[PDB]
Amino acid sequence: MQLNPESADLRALAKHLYDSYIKSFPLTKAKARAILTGKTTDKSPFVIYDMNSLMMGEDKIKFKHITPLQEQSKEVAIRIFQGCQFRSVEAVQEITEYAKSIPGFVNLDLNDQVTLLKYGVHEIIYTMLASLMNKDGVLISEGQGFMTREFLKSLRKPFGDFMEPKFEFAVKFNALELDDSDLAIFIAVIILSGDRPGLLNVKPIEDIQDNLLQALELQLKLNHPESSQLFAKLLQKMTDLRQIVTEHVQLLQVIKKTETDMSLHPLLQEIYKDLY
């Protein structure tokens, strides 16, 4: 490894993605970890660990999406699924905004931009969800709430089966001990996968992903001295992300049909559409 104008550009791209990632995403992994360990000056997430705490939390947590005027489901499982939809729709926009900051992305075929986003969004969602998870639960409502793994597992079928796979993945992924600087480049690599179905102008996409991939490896080598193979292990996780996405969609069909009290926001329908 040398310090030459190539590496210097790599590091410059690294910083640009990071800066763009900080402004595009509200709750970074840096802050989530602090909250998750009390090492925070902010209040303290309200813990939802049973039905009584859920009910209480619905009052004492100001959810950005609910209002007293509107009426929501009578079934807690459905209400919780609704807030997750709202959060996912918001997540789609943060990710879209982040994508536009990736050098070159905006100058791609708009139709291909759409295709990269349709497929990358969910992988990036579960990637960044890990930042908010420990093995006990997950931060919600941008850190004002904390919902436990076991409480989510206790929702009536089939809802009690949606988050388990994500916790499973998060424990393995968080053992990589990535930080935001690593993550910023990683999700950029995900967005610019030239092997997504339906792409038309692949060449310029791979040319971007190659830069991203160089910038990532250099980032991992500089930032994780005591863990070789981190680059390979991380690429492997991109595989596992495609599997949990497939599985999530499939289970989502079990919801669909066999449920009717809720429906899927159109943005989410656009994405899940002709997915896998």
């Binding site: 926009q93 536009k100 708009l110 159109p266 656009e270 994405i271 002709d274």
Partner: peptide, 13 residues
């Protein structure tokens, strides 16, 4: 025949 009108709008602004 746009199958992702919303995403398309999001990207256009």
């Amino acid at each position: 025949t746009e199958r992702h009108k919303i995403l398309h709008r999001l990207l256009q602004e």
